[PDB]
């Protein structure tokens, strides 16, 4: 999964991620809620007030109205409800033995000249009995004063901030300077409650995330090395620590995210700075009204251009990246997966296609995941391999080919094919999956797509030009009266079946159980499903399709004109070739995908070509 951390399980990593995001959001106490609400309702045609950028960096004396970012009446009470729902409760100064101040929210403040506006929330997670199990440290970073930030042009101020981080280990040492004594109290408090460092989660966004990275660098180091084993997840940090300790999460079109090389200002710092970084998620796009806009992108991408900072705002971090977490595709992804998140206003959402524009980014690598919203989305895949997720609402997909998985989720969803119905084949396994094979043999596996739209020259037909809408029924594609039939197939049961193809070619669907798929002399498509399936080619130019937790299969009679299609499987990295997944056991080639496997019986490794082993 894209947020896997250290050696935690996939699931444990996600739970950590969500806690990190919860506490991070809390640290801002709903600062961008007014702006995000206006953006969602109205669009970004008005751009972004320079005052929100200074609020992000400098801190605020609040909670009031400095414009044009709206109130926000209920705001700190909603932020606090939400952090608590996510399982966290602010820890008091008194609980810590802390001598210093906390404001009316329970926020602690920096301790040395130059850090006195730095803030941090210290929160605790308690089991059903009232015992502390975990501590959360959420840095809200500043500089701070709200006071050097108006004496210059906003761009000259951003530029100087950025250049000040690297020299004299300022960014590195930041958390030791600001919170060195507080963190000793946290160490004392944690131990008294039987916690060790592994039970401490460290997060923050922005300058907060700079602080997460700074703590990691010092965790060696200071506080008796108590936090050396703590968990560090930074959002939208400009810096990366030198440790291997921090998961650095961010949107790729966030101008602040990765702006420094470690903490080094470079030529890329004030333009596109999308070179891959070990600790960082490098390919998560916020597909927002700015990113979608020709007009907005007339100016070069730069952190010095305030409108670019819309991609930095925390509410969209929360909301979009929680939809990654929630994805049916989540466990196919890895740290650098290309992920396009639908982040558009209501106005733009009605008429803009969410797609990988690859704008202000280095060229994307591997398969593309596109995650919709709970509203009606327009989602367009490319002619590569794409995993399209509609989530709730009535979504419409398009896709330019390749190998794909299209999930429409809740609602009434449609796949617009934008070619003729005659140039595609359709199959249907009776277990909810409808398969679409294109004229180039690219296959999409679809769920919850009730309607297909084709562009008939036409006639076809029939009565109906030009675009025509087919209902997806058990017996085929129904345009009112006519059926466009499903390709010939044999369907099994969820037990162990033996299925036999006809000489003309069949789609063979074993479904669950350990099946025995005996193809014939024709061009068959083998889908063994869950279970450990024995599939024989029988002749022909055959296709073996593997999706999900496909099990430990055996393929017999595999030749040069046959194809293994791996789609929606475990253990794949951007640009994997089969040679990464291949070994030999006697005269058989074994291909492993996480804990799934295909043994090609009596096929020597060296005889295999990448053209008939598609890894999507
Ligand atoms: Ca990376
Ligand atoms: Ca990138
Ligand atoms: Ca949707
Ligand atoms: Ca595609
Ligand atoms: Ca939907
Ligand atoms: Ca079966
Ligand atoms: Ca099976
Ligand atoms: Ca065959
Ligand atoms: Ca063959
Ligand atoms: Ca299987
Ligand atoms: Zn207990
Ligand atoms: Zn057999």
Domain ranges of the chain: 1-325, 326-485, 486-616
Chain centre distance of CA 396: 21
299 burial level (CB within 10 Å; 0-12, 13-18, 19+): exposed
For tokens 């070509």, the residue is: 609
Spatial CB neighbours of 29, under 8 Å, sequence gap ≥ 6: 62, 63, 75, 76, 79, 105
CA of 544 to the centre of ligand 6 (A): 16
**Is omega for the bond preceding 74 within 30 degrees of 0, making it cis?**
no
Task: For residues 232 and 137, give the distance between their C-alpha atoms in angstroms, rounded to a whole number.
Answer: 10
CA atoms of 275 and 282, how far apart (whole Å) = 8
> Across-strand partners of 598?
553, 591
Structure tokens at 289: 């009204």
Both tokens of 433, joined, read 């999956």
CA-to-CA dists, residue 614 to 111, 404, 442, 546, 548, angstroms: 57, 12, 10, 10, 15
The CATH homologous superfamily of the domain defined by 1-325: Alpha/Beta hydrolase fold, catalytic domain (3.40.50.1820)
Dist CA 390 CA 376 (whole Å): 8
Ligand with smallest separation from the Cα of 556:
12
Q: Is 612 helix (H, G, I), strand (E, B) or coil?
A: helix
CA 518 / ligand 8 centre spacing (Å): 8
Task: Please tell me the distance from the alpha carbon of residue 136 to that of residue 22, in angstroms, as a whole number.
Answer: 10
Q: Are 497 and 529 in contact (CB under 8 A)?
A: no
Q: What share of the chain is helix, strand, coil (3-state, %, to 5)?
A: 25, 25, 50
- Report the structure determination method: X-ray
Secondary element (H or E) of residue 95: helix 93-96
Angle subtended by helix axes 314-325 and 33-42, to nearest 10: 70
HSE, side-chain direction, 13 A CA sphere, residue 300: 9
Catalytic one of 206, 241, 286, 367: 206
Which residue do the tokens 């602010």 mark? Answer: 90
Residue among 589, 614, 615 at smallest CA distance from 602: 589
Kindly identify the ligand whose nearest atom is closest to the C-alpha of 127: 11
Separate counts of helices (H) and strands (E) for the chain: 12, 35
DSSP letter (8 states) at residue 582:
E
471 has catalytic annotation: no
Centre of ligand 5 from the C-alpha of residue 371, in Å: 11
CA distances from 494 to 524, 528, 597 (A): 21, 11, 20
Residue 403 CA to ligand 4 center (angstroms) comes to 6
CA distance 35 to 251: 19
Q: Which of 414, 406, 411 shows the shortest CA–CA distance to 328?
A: 406
CB of 364 closer than 8 Å to CB of 356: yes
Cα 501 to ligand 6 centre (Å): 15
Q: 15 CB contacts (<8 Å, ≥6 apart)?
A: none
- Which residues, at least 6 apart from 491, have a Cβ–Cβ distance to it below 8 Å? 429, 430, 499, 509, 511
* Ligand showing the shortest atom-to-Cα distance for residue 376: 3
The two tokens of residue 366 are 């591997």
* Distance from C-alpha of 430 to C-alpha of 412, rounded to nearest angstrom: 19
Going from the C-alpha of 511 to that of each of 114, 207, 444, 551, 570, the distances in angstroms are: 64, 51, 18, 12, 19
Residues with CB under 5 A from ligand 6 (ion): 492, 497, 510-511, 513, 515
Which H/E stretch holds residue 346? helix 346-349
Among 265, 253, 255, 209, CA closest to 232: 209
In this structure, which ligand is nearest to the CA of 492?
6
Resolution in Å equals 2.2
Cα distance between residue 267 and residue 300, in whole Å: 14
């Amino acid at each position: 999964g894209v947020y896997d951390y250290k050696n935690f399980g996939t699931a444990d990593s996600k739970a950590l991620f969500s806690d990190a995001m919860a506490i991070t959001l809390y640290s801002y106490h709903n600062l961008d809620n007014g702006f995000a609400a206006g953006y969602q309702h109205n669009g970004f045609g008005l751009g972004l007030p320079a005052t929100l950028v200074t609020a992000l960096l400098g801190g605020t004396d609040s909670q009031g109205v400095i414009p044009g970012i709206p109130w926000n009446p209920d705001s700190e009470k909603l932020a606090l409800d939400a952090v608590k729902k996510a399982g966290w409760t602010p820890i008091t100064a008194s609980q810590l033995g802390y001598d210093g101040k906390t404001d009316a929210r329970g926020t602690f403040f920096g301790e040395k000249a130059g850090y006195t506006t730095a803030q941090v929330e210290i929160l605790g997670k308690y089991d059903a009995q009232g015992h502390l199990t975990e501590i959360g440290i959420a840095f809200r970073g500043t500089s701070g004063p709200r006071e050097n930030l108006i004496l210059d042009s906003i761009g000259a101020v951003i530029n100087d901030l950025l250049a000040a981080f690297g020299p004299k280990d300022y960014a590195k040492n930041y958390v030791g300077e600001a919170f060195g004594n507080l963190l000793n109290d946290v160490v004392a408090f944690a131990k008294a409650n039987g916690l060790s460092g592994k039970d401490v989660l460290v997060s923050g966004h922005s300058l907060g995330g700079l602080a997460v990275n700074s703590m990691a660098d010092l965790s060696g180091g200071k506080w008796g090395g108590f936090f050396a084993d703590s968990n560090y997840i930074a959002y939208a940090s400009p810096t990366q620590s030198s440790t291997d300790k921090v998961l650095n999460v961010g949107y790729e079109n966030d101008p602040v995210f990765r702006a420094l090389d470690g903490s080094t200002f470079t030529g890329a710092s004030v333009g596109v700075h999308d070179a891959p970084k070990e600790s960082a998620t490098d390919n998560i796009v916020s597909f927002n009204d700015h990113y979608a806009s020709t007009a907005w992108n007339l100016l070069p991408f730069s952190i010095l251009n305030i409108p670019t900072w819309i991609s930095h705002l925390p509410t969209a971090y929360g909301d979009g990246m929680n939809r990654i977490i929630e994805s049916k595709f989540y466990d196919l992804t890895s740290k650098d997966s290309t992920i396009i998140v639908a982040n558009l206003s209501d106005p733009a959402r009605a008429n803009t296609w969410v797609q990988d524009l690859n704008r202000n980014a280095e060229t994307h690598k591997g398969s593309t995941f596109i995650i919709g919203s709970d509203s009606n989305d327009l989602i367009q895949g490319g002619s590569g391999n794409d995993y399209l997720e509609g989530r709730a609402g009535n979504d419409t997909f398009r896709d330019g080919g390749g190998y794909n998985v299209i999930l429409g989720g809740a609602g009434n969803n449609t796949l617009d094919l934008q070619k003729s119905v005659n140039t595609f084949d359709f199959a249907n396994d009776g277990a909810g999956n409808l398969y679409v094979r294109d004229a180039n043999g690219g296959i999409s596996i679809t769920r919850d797509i009730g309607s297909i739209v084709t562009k008939e020259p036409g006639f076809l037909w029939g009565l109906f030009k030009d675009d025509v809408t087919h209902s997806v029924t058990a017996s085929g594609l129904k345009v009112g009266s006519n059926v466009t039939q499903y390709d010939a197939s044999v369907k099994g049961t969820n037990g162990a079946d033996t299925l036999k193809a006809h000489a003309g070619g069949d789609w063979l669907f074993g479904l669950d159980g350990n099946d025995h798929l005996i193809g014939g002399v024709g061009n068959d498509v083998f889908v063994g499903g869950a279970g450990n399936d024995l599939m024989e080619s029988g002749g022909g130019a055959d296709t073996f399709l593997f999706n999900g937790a496909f099990g430990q299969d055996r393929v017999v009679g595999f030749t040069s004109n046959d194809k293994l299609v791996f789609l929606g499987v475990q253990g794949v990295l951007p640009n994997d070739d089969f040679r990464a997944h291949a070994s030999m056991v006697g005269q058989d080639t074994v291909l492993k995908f996480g804990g799934d496997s295909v043994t090609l019986v009596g096929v020597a490794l060296n005889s295999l070509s990448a053209d008939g082993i598609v890894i999507a």
